[model samples]
Target: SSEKLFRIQCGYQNYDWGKIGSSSAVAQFVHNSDPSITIDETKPYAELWMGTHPSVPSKAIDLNNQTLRDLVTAKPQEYLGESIITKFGSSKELPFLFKVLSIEKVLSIQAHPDKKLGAQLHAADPKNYPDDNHKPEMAIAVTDFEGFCGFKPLDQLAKTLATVPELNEIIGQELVDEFISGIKLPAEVGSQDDVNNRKLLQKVFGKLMNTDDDVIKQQTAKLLERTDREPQVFKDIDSRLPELIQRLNKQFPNDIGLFCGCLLLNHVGLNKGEAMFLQAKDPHAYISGDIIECMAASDNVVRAGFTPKFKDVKNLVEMLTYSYESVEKQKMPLQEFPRSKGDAVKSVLYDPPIAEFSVLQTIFDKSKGGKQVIEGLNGPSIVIATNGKGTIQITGDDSTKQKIDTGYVFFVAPGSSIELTADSANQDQDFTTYRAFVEA
Candidate 1:
């Protein structure tokens, strides 16, 4: 086995024409170090990633001074399987997953297809679909976070929308008719027109931007009015969209825009130490807040709404209509162990159904003043050390553990287990750590 080396962090700045109209809080937070900032206030969003995925490979210096991509490309059979090369016609293994995260405000409404559906879709229409497919992801809370996740129970959603006396008028008679038809019928035997009901919701959204009808506008205003009354119930909705629209319009003039509300996607909320796992093909949207996200090694994403990107209402609604239901959010599960001394190491695990990704969080007690070793299966892993300081050990002939401080991250390749130990008695602070790895 080769010695494990530390990987570099890569960040990207996404500046699109629609982005000219809107902004990302991630860019502002990285530059100004302001955590309470809003999405509209941020100038640009940065996608920070550390991975060997082919779309973007984190670089490191080599003996011959060749790029990481060059090294991987030159010897595809050695790093990536020859059969993989024959199948994909490329040697790029994409060993690790990449992330484009937001520091403030939630992301767009989206979902990924399962492996079978993904393969079928790709084979049927490669132009619309890519070879790489849907993957489940786990988002860990770095700070206090809020979001809209899975779909609300169908009956509950229908009841809520029906009770919104304000939406009835503004959505117009045509949309009201469609909305009623979709929810009124049974789930199984409902006509294909029920699918159009979802499309009706999208049509109503488009109408919100198209017309200035006083009745509909007044009805739309009622939705906001009702939301303000119970802030926590609509916490994600209350925080970002209203302000985002104002700022976006100020930045770009005469550009008609759409603000994503709970109408189009499911809403979810998470406190510190809490997480939400998005399964393959689960349609969702992020409303607001920041999080640490990990997923399988793929970049394919199908977005429905929330951004100014292309809105395929017909396709999005159809996909969402299938198996769109909410489940309880899982709390971070921790394992506790007392050290030889009086201290202890608290470890938390985040594992979704997808076999490709797993994240572990470790908390070290300063009083312990010793090392703790944790073993993982053969795959790529990233360990983030939080709280106190320590050096991590990889047991082997050429064993060398990297010394890491607070907010520092280290990586372990496949076929390796790590042992973390404190430098000395003086270095005594409770350490909190997070680890990301792949399963067989």
Candidate 2:
């Protein structure tokens, strides 16, 4: 409790879609803190998590190896701060969790329930829900990140259906007309247009999920044949679209989810540092690449398709907000974090509209550009130095200094002001850390 800043160790979850062995960035990050960890290129490395999540809580390195939950429970006001406890009604639980995801294959197409619905789902199925909390998340790309997010412009989806006959037959001509017609039916036509749009989506998406498996297989084969001709039928959509679907097929062969209903989703590609917010019930699936993901501390996923996990089709269909928008609208705007001097530090905040957490990406390159003095906010923050070498000098009830390097994670208490500088030990390489915090 006397320590102003405590280093922590995180645990990772391995999934089949993760980059296998040392080829994985997730593995590299996890192994950085613990050199004793063996790299098995044969096994997939998925998510390296940092938080009080019950599945795999981050362990404090400085405090008798106790978990963050243990420390918080012992001194909620000290660790979480009174302001955060006040906001959460004296709860010691960390409101958010952070992770680095290495996606080697497509993730389940799913949406999370808002708070109330999350409780209901958890009560109904504890094995799946585990915790009853809304999980609105923001993903920042560590590399080029691609995914299916929200519903695509319905007109684009209409084009997708029209161009791919297999998908057209599955939804049938009647529903297709409703879908295609709703988009151009004149916006001034009042809420009827809105009602029909949602109705058609519900019916069409429901059909995609519940279609007879035999029929799904039959249509999947046909879609493959259409792409097999290499007819440049897909060339109009985007040359990469064909290849993307082919790779998805290799991962999930004969699954209609590979192209049918999911084609309605917006294909979002983000370069490094770009981000997107996944609000409650916004259906999305991670397609590929690495991402630094932060979300409210819950994992109640209502999955519709694209995985071997439990498919809560009924919940997913009903839970989706069905509010369609372009990928441009889904992206979160980045703003510069303004507490700095000269070119010594570069801080960018991915400010999403959620109150749960905000992520600040700080790059400290060598020379004077590597230094930053951070003023303390009312709430505690979790900072993970995903890559870098640096130093942190804290001033609070007491001032303490420490040297830091790649894989360093520290808990910043409510009152400690910190001065961070990139240690020049790693040549001129940039030091980077993603800090997740909620401000009063």
Candidate 3:
């Protein structure tokens, strides 16, 4: 009874302005047209997680005296089954995935291999192998967003690229020929040679920006010349090739913004409330879009063209499976649930079965007289309340109801559920809540 009440607290850090001020880029892009975009470094555009296993530990707590993680670790068998202790080989397990997100220009158009391919690749090259091989991500639009999620239908890309004559001239005759004629190369051809190609593309991009050669110089001049007359076209090209001249100017002053604009695969847009899911090994390019994204935990990124970090342009070009058709965006269905008075729960089953993840949204109708009580889910869960005002009572089998409000996130560990009820009639709005967890 003397134990102080503790809540799940998250750590925040600030990332400042520069070409790539990562911590706050999403906020900056979201609030465009401000005198200057000031990004909030503390709340990152994304969050990375490290918690407990689904089968064993259900909750994690901070280092405080009464947090869940500390409590669970102290007596594993008492809280978790004995089998969990054996399976994990330890009392503590890291379960939840975490992230750091940015909203800006294109992130690399890339994909991860499925488990089988990942294992093979890992066996062949451990350096690049990631422990979590499959990538299943869901993006929730925090603001109006736009991005290219997967490969454009090959035919569509062919047609779009074909319209840009100057691109062909600049990229070189051979490269253009390969792209236009529908070339098919072995999938594995450039996989191993990525490092070398990354270097080569950097070299080529630098030379193109700096060269004194008449033909090359004229090519650059002509492209810019044309760009000036057609502002929109120029803007598009500029977004893609900002590094052209500056990258060439080994001796010229270059701004990081130039590098930001010049590098990265460019795609189109995404609006607020819309999301893009990246399946394993889907080739994608982000032109522009800022969003909130959740994915299975892993960190093994192999980028191709579209970044200043490394070129690998040749490998990037080679890795693509080309075609001439336009690819349509994949749609995710949203289900709305209605709630009435006390002890109400609504679950919307997603169409495609998601491994290790499910989303549940709860709404509390304040119009009814009594408070609403919801039992906690069976696994690890994140509960975000979007509307109304209420107190959350967690009967910890030993504890009492604690009050929580909107804009706050609560972690519901397995075996823990809480009661929700209106604290006062003055609190007018019904509570709209969302829950995310691994499937049972």
Candidate 4:
């Protein structure tokens, strides 16, 4: 009958993009939360969603075995706290959904609509746009992660256009030359940068998407030869850009977005603990590796390509905010998390600019008796031990509570202080846990 602290069991999505079986960090966390789960190595383990999202809501393990959505409706203020309700508005909902993603191959090249666009899209086509909410997601790398975030700089696009004649052929040589003529690299970006680029982007992108099947194959063949000869062009990026294109062609041959991704998008690689924030209307795609992802509670993805699913190419090309930047600008600013009144363990925040969610990574050597104390967070949270054995010590006025695991998830209620203790028996130095929460 109380809400001090309780461990929750969360479910995961097994899409084709996931890593199969125990090869997935997502699957490992899922099995840890529920040992009864029979893992199938053949199945692709995609995403583990936590929080009160109706698509895949986490269930309360204790407290009468209710769904998190039900519990939140019954007691919104108690679960979310007054500040959260006031700030987020008294919607019968939770703002954020936490997830662990095990990406094996290319996911859809997509973008989430803004709030206004989301409402319009959902109203127009409820089957596709599941919710009238914007999805602004942030990703923290649990392992080495590769992805495409936003568009590359205008000058880079011009260079790419010059290097590949097939691109200029598809997007009229005149148009390509005009776009390049307008490009001023060293010049300061004017306020109308995205506005001006949107026109050219639409023209080039529309032609690329709508080209004939034969034209696509022919262009793809030409690019294959070009990528093979020009491996050193992306030397600063990786000698692998050409190989990356080959892999994309192998996975999705003649897909125009494959060519576009290599030529136009900013390729990003995040090492463990590094993070990036993907704002609404920004174009992105997950390339590979496991990631701890958090986002606004919605599944409305406007996909352009790299997917067999429905491609809303029109909206994707139009809806994107068209803000292009270098990969350096896409990374989130990480800072050390302030601890509660205890020995400060090593925990860092992958805090995005948005209010919907943020993630904290706490790394500790439990053999050294490291106790992870996190305090003063104003909203509900989802905590999961990604690696190494640990015990969460929840001290209460009524009782002393504990949960054990090497990989488990616990839902922390609003305004409660927690002390995480690593299993003293496990002597691994790289023991870590990731917690996703919102502070309004």
Off by over 4 Å in 1: 5-9, 14-45, 61-91, 123-127, 169-222, 225-260, 264-266, 297-299, 321-327, 330-344, 366-370, 386-388, 396-399, 422-430
Per-residue lDDT over 204-238 for candidate 4, one digit per residue giving the tens place of the 0 to 100 score:
66677777778878898888887787766654344
Candidate with maximal TM-score: 2
User: 2 or 3: which has the higher lDDT?
Assistant: 2
lDDT of all predictions: 0.52, 0.78, 0.44, 0.78
Per-residue alpha-carbon lDDT of candidate 1 for residues 1-440, written as tens digits (9 for 90 to 100): 23354533333445332121123323432333222333444354545465555555544422232334554576555434354456445565434463535544335567777777677667876766766566667777655655656554555445544555554455566766665565533544355645654455445545544455354345445555555565444444335444443433343322222233454344456775577777775666554444567876554566654465655444444454343344354334443433112233556666666666677766666776666666544455666553567777675433465666654555565556667765465455676666776544
- Per-residue CA lDDT of candidate 3, range 203-224, in tens? 3333333433355445545545
* RMSD to true structure for each model, in Å: 7.3, 2.7, 9.2, 2.8
TM-score for candidate 2: 0.91
> Residue by residue across 1-440, what tens digits does model 2's lDDT show?
43557788888988889988877778887788788888787999999988777778888877888898778888888878877887766455688888889999888888899889999999999998999898898998887989988887667777887887888888899888877776653443248776677777778888787788899889888777778786488767656677777778888988756754347787788987788989898888898988899988676888766777788777887888776778798787868777544344558888777787988888866655456777776777888776657776674333467766777788887777777777765755677778888765
Using all chains and alpha carbons, the TM-scores for the candidates as numbered come to 0.67, 0.91, 0.60, 0.90
Error of 2 at 71 (Å): 1.6
Against the true structure, candidate 1 reaches a TM-score of 0.67
Number of clashing residue pairs in every model?
A: 12, 2, 34, 0
Superposition error at 302 for model 2 (Å): 1.0
